[PDB]
């Protein structure tokens, strides 16, 4: 399969035509997406097969072909870019200053941007081009607007 680094669409033909269910990141030979996009199923790339390697329903993350590779963190100060890949539309950078999710287990960066559900797993980057996490898990607020965490996995 195609193992070039970068951002990929995740598609299914199990529905009408070809439907984009989400997005993910190829880095160091490993495919990274949100658990809720694949539910941990295998993926095709050409006639290549990607098997799940690691997942966590609570983190809502999954890796294919090896361990989670993405270890950059939001600085807590500086703007970030959501590299949004919406269904049937080109990759588009959207620059924003994250808010905070406050939890009993600590503070998490969060982005207040509203994109189709099929954008689930698009990467959030820092000024140096590093993936600080994945968009598409969060919350609907008083306004009926969507705020996503900056969801990041642990590297061993």
């Amino acid at each position: 399969g195609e193992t070039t680094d970068g951002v990929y669409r995740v598609m299914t033909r199990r529905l009408l035509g070809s439907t984009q269910v989400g997005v993910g990141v190829m880095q160091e030979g490993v495919f990274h997406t949100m658990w809720h996009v694949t539910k941990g199923a295998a993926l095709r790339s050409g006639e290549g097969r990607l098997d799940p390697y690691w997942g966590d329903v609570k983190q809502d993350l999954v890796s294919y072909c090896g361990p989670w590779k993405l270890d950059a963190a939001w600085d807590g100060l500086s703007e970030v870019q959501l590299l949004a890949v919406p269904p049937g539309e080109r990759a588009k950078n959207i620059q924003t200053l994250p808010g905070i999710f406050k939890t009993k287990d600590g503070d998490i960066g969060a982005v207040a941007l509203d994109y189709p559900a099929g954008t689930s797993g698009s990467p959030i980057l820092d000024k140096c081009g590093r993936v600080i996490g994945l968009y598409g898990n969060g919350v609907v607020i008083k306004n009926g607007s969507y705020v996503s965490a900056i969801t990041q996995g642990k590297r061993e």
Partner: protein, 39 residues
């Protein structure tokens, strides 16, 4: 069977479009990976 298609390189792009606010939200995270607003 789900399949993947390459959509782009991962780069910072200068003069992107700039939008969204920065809310401070009290949230809880359940065992099913669902976040919710605490009030």
């Amino acid at each position: 069977d789900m399949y993947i298609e390459r959509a782009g390189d991962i780069t910072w792009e200068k003069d992107a479009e700039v939008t969204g606010n920065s809310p401070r939200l009290d949230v809880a995270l359940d065992e099913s990976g669902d976040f919710s607003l605490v009030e």
